[PDB]
Design a protein around this motif. Structure first.
Motif, PDB file in Angstrom:
ATOM      1  N   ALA A  34       3.218  11.988   0.463  1.00 49.19           N
ATOM      2  CA  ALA A  34       2.720  11.153  -0.614  1.00 49.19           C
ATOM      3  C   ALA A  34       1.990   9.891  -0.148  1.00 49.19           C
ATOM      4  O   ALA A  34       1.804   9.641   1.028  1.00 49.19           O
ATOM      5  CB  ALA A  34       3.865  10.756  -1.537  1.00 49.19           C
ATOM      6  N   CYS A  35       1.571   9.101  -1.119  1.00 53.04           N
ATOM      7  CA  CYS A  35       0.733   7.953  -0.868  1.00 53.04           C
ATOM      8  C   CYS A  35       1.592   6.725  -0.658  1.00 53.04           C
ATOM      9  O   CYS A  35       2.692   6.635  -1.187  1.00 53.04           O
ATOM     10  CB  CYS A  35      -0.213   7.776  -2.043  1.00 53.04           C
ATOM     11  SG  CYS A  35      -0.283   9.320  -2.984  1.00 53.04           S
ATOM     12  N   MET A  36       1.092   5.771   0.113  1.00 50.33           N
ATOM     13  CA  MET A  36       1.811   4.512   0.270  1.00 50.33           C
ATOM     14  C   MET A  36       1.775   3.641  -0.987  1.00 50.33           C
ATOM     15  O   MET A  36       2.518   2.647  -1.079  1.00 50.33           O
ATOM     16  CB  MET A  36       1.237   3.732   1.433  1.00 50.33           C
ATOM     17  CG  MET A  36      -0.118   3.112   1.144  1.00 50.33           C
ATOM     18  SD  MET A  36      -0.667   2.292   2.642  1.00 50.33           S
ATOM     19  CE  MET A  36      -2.173   1.533   2.058  1.00 50.33           C
ATOM     20  N   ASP A  37       0.914   4.011  -1.935  1.00 48.39           N
ATOM     21  CA  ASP A  37       0.701   3.253  -3.180  1.00 48.39           C
ATOM     22  C   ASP A  37       1.985   2.626  -3.744  1.00 48.39           C
ATOM     23  O   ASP A  37       3.028   3.282  -3.847  1.00 48.39           O
ATOM     24  CB  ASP A  37       0.056   4.150  -4.237  1.00 48.39           C
ATOM     25  CG  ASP A  37      -0.509   3.355  -5.418  1.00 48.39           C
ATOM     26  OD1 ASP A  37       0.257   2.977  -6.324  1.00 48.39           O
ATOM     27  OD2 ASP A  37      -1.726   3.117  -5.439  1.00 48.39           O
ATOM     28  N   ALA A  38       1.895   1.339  -4.087  1.00 43.92           N
ATOM     29  CA  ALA A  38       3.055   0.543  -4.501  1.00 43.92           C
ATOM     30  C   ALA A  38       3.696   1.020  -5.792  1.00 43.92           C
ATOM     31  O   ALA A  38       4.834   0.646  -6.116  1.00 43.92           O
ATOM     32  CB  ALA A  38       2.644  -0.932  -4.655  1.00 43.92           C
ATOM     33  N   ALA A  59      -1.783   5.901   3.599  1.00 48.91           N
ATOM     34  CA  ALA A  59      -2.805   5.519   2.637  1.00 48.91           C
ATOM     35  C   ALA A  59      -3.572   6.762   2.189  1.00 48.91           C
ATOM     36  O   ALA A  59      -4.124   7.483   3.017  1.00 48.91           O
ATOM     37  CB  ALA A  59      -3.756   4.507   3.227  1.00 48.91           C
ATOM     38  N   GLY A  60      -3.601   7.016   0.888  1.00 44.98           N
ATOM     39  CA  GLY A  60      -4.349   8.137   0.359  1.00 44.98           C
ATOM     40  C   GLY A  60      -3.655   9.480   0.367  1.00 44.98           C
ATOM     41  O   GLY A  60      -4.199  10.466  -0.178  1.00 44.98           O
ATOM     42  N   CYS A  61      -2.426   9.513   0.898  1.00 46.70           N
ATOM     43  CA  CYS A  61      -1.650  10.747   0.979  1.00 46.70           C
ATOM     44  C   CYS A  61      -2.502  11.827   1.651  1.00 46.70           C
ATOM     45  O   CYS A  61      -2.602  12.954   1.170  1.00 46.70           O
ATOM     46  CB  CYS A  61      -1.185  11.202  -0.412  1.00 46.70           C
ATOM     47  SG  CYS A  61      -1.707  10.142  -1.804  1.00 46.70           S
ATOM     48  N   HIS A  87      -0.835  13.344  -4.674  1.00 47.37           N
ATOM     49  CA  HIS A  87      -1.903  12.364  -4.801  1.00 47.37           C
ATOM     50  C   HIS A  87      -1.587  11.571  -6.061  1.00 47.37           C
ATOM     51  O   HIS A  87      -0.497  11.713  -6.621  1.00 47.37           O
ATOM     52  CB  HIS A  87      -3.283  13.027  -4.901  1.00 47.37           C
ATOM     53  CG  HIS A  87      -3.916  13.333  -3.579  1.00 47.37           C
ATOM     54  ND1 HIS A  87      -3.197  13.446  -2.410  1.00 47.37           N
ATOM     55  CD2 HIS A  87      -5.213  13.523  -3.239  1.00 47.37           C
ATOM     56  CE1 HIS A  87      -4.019  13.724  -1.412  1.00 47.37           C
ATOM     57  NE2 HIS A  87      -5.250  13.766  -1.886  1.00 47.37           N
ATOM     58  N   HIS A  88      -2.515  10.743  -6.522  1.00 47.57           N
ATOM     59  CA  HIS A  88      -2.292  10.043  -7.788  1.00 47.57           C
ATOM     60  C   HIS A  88      -3.596   9.598  -8.435  1.00 47.57           C
ATOM     61  O   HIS A  88      -4.624   9.521  -7.762  1.00 47.57           O
ATOM     62  CB  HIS A  88      -1.372   8.843  -7.570  1.00 47.57           C
ATOM     63  CG  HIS A  88      -1.952   7.806  -6.671  1.00 47.57           C
ATOM     64  ND1 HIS A  88      -2.280   6.544  -7.110  1.00 47.57           N
ATOM     65  CD2 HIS A  88      -2.284   7.849  -5.360  1.00 47.57           C
ATOM     66  CE1 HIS A  88      -2.772   5.845  -6.103  1.00 47.57           C
ATOM     67  NE2 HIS A  88      -2.789   6.617  -5.032  1.00 47.57           N
ATOM     68  N   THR A  89      -3.555   9.311  -9.740  1.00 50.33           N
ATOM     69  CA  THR A  89      -4.723   8.756 -10.437  1.00 50.33           C
ATOM     70  C   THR A  89      -4.943   7.270 -10.110  1.00 50.33           C
ATOM     71  O   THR A  89      -3.999   6.572  -9.754  1.00 50.33           O
ATOM     72  CB  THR A  89      -4.611   8.919 -11.968  1.00 50.33           C
ATOM     73  OG1 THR A  89      -3.492   8.165 -12.460  1.00 50.33           O
ATOM     74  CG2 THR A  89      -4.437  10.396 -12.343  1.00 50.33           C
ATOM     75  N   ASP A  90      -6.185   6.799 -10.240  1.00 49.07           N
ATOM     76  CA  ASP A  90      -6.549   5.416  -9.886  1.00 49.07           C
ATOM     77  C   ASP A  90      -6.113   5.083  -8.443  1.00 49.07           C
ATOM     78  O   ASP A  90      -5.423   4.093  -8.200  1.00 49.07           O
ATOM     79  CB  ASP A  90      -5.931   4.425 -10.893  1.00 49.07           C
ATOM     80  CG  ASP A  90      -6.376   2.970 -10.662  1.00 49.07           C
ATOM     81  OD1 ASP A  90      -7.585   2.732 -10.439  1.00 49.07           O
ATOM     82  OD2 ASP A  90      -5.504   2.065 -10.696  1.00 49.07           O
ATOM     83  N   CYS A  91      -6.427   5.904  -7.463  1.00 49.36           N
ATOM     84  CA  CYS A  91      -5.920   5.596  -6.117  1.00 49.36           C
ATOM     85  C   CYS A  91      -6.950   4.931  -5.250  1.00 49.36           C
ATOM     86  O   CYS A  91      -8.095   5.060  -5.464  1.00 49.36           O
ATOM     87  CB  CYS A  91      -5.310   6.789  -5.411  1.00 49.36           C
ATOM     88  SG  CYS A  91      -5.188   6.742  -3.593  1.00 49.36           S
ATOM     89  N   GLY A  92      -6.446   4.209  -4.274  1.00 46.50           N
ATOM     90  CA  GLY A  92      -7.192   3.271  -3.450  1.00 46.50           C
ATOM     91  C   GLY A  92      -8.416   3.844  -2.758  1.00 46.50           C
ATOM     92  O   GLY A  92      -9.442   3.168  -2.648  1.00 46.50           O
ATOM     93  N   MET A  93      -8.314   5.091  -2.300  1.00 50.00           N
ATOM     94  CA  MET A  93      -9.386   5.747  -1.542  1.00 50.00           C
ATOM     95  C   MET A  93     -10.619   6.092  -2.391  1.00 50.00           C
ATOM     96  O   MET A  93     -11.667   6.474  -1.857  1.00 50.00           O
ATOM     97  CB  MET A  93      -8.844   7.013  -0.880  1.00 50.00           C
ATOM     98  CG  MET A  93      -7.426   6.854  -0.342  1.00 50.00           C
ATOM     99  SD  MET A  93      -7.153   5.490   0.834  1.00 50.00           S
ATOM    100  CE  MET A  93      -7.728   6.236   2.366  1.00 50.00           C
TER     101      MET A  93
END
Ligand SMILES: [Cl-]
Ligand SMILES: [Zn+2]
Lengths: 163, 163
Positions: A34-38, A59-61, A87-93
């Motif tokens: 998974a992503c590091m996203d907070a 970052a970015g899974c 993954h996820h919506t609105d992600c950094g990459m």
């Protein structure tokens, strides 16, 4: 004080109600990438309990060689047999590009990283791409289930992607 | 069904209680570099709430190029300025050396991985070597706090490591 001091204090509370030790191999024989996203609390997202699951995050899974390494170790040495890709919506990459990212870094530092920043423009597409990277790798083969999802950061729901 | 199936069913209940979306940048401007180890619930260990912290995890909590990439992205694009590095007692990273692991793989598949397995003999000493990797990396300079800890799988306590 810093947030690290804050988190350390929280650990004292955690420690007081801790039950352990558990065996090293994941009791549920599963690995999560998974992503590091907070905004992704991966454990509560999947209802994971301690000792059940390997959780890999970057970052970015992105299925990098570090993830491959981590999955190989997971399967070959610790008996995991299922893989969930998140993954996820609105992600950094989605917000930046490799070429721009390395350019900004070279401005400041004088050098370009040797590594790829691995940005991508679309979550759903990249889950497919991410799935393909695991499928074609010769070292991560001991899985009986490989599935990928996009976590919706607005609703909390996981939506599967078809390879 | 599979464990993946049970985890997806858990997500339904998760999404029921979910509140979002939150903003992308970590609200506590901190990144955690940790281990995939199944016995580490990093969020609970540190009293982390959704939206507060980047959490990076791989096998052995090693500062690979993928971790540097993720820290660089975390600092430059999303404003983190604290780093917490974690290792853990009883490493499965002890039970094997790189060369042995790679040989097993090559015997099995015909192919030797390009990547270093990154095993280490001692968690505490490798926290020091981990800290050193980050400190001398030119792409991860923005942190004002860099600290490393070993997490005891028997007590739940973090024991800080000094360089
Ligand atoms: Cl996590
Ligand atoms: Zn993301």
């Amino acid at each position: 004080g810093t947030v690290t001091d804050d988190y350390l204090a929280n650990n004292v509370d955690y420690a007081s109600g801790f039950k352990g030790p558990l065996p090293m191999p994941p009791s549920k024989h599963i690995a999560i990438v998974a992503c590091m996203d907070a905004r992704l609390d991966v454990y509560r997202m999947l209802g994971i309990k301690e000792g059940e699951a390997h959780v890999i995050r970057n970052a970015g899974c992105v299925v990098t060689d570090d993830v491959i390494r981590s999955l190989a170790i997971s399967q070959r040495l610790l008996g995991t047999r299922e893989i969930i890709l998140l993954h996820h919506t609105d992600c950094g990459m989605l917000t930046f590009t490799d070429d721009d990212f390395k350019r900004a870094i070279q401005d400041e530092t004088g050098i370009r990283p040797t590594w790829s920043p691995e940005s991508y423009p679309d979550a759903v597409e990249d889950v497919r791409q991410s799935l393909r990277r695991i499928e074609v790798n010769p070292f991560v083969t001991k899985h009986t289930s490989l599935r990928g999802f996009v976590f919706d950061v607005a609703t909390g729901k996981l939506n599967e992607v078809t390879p």
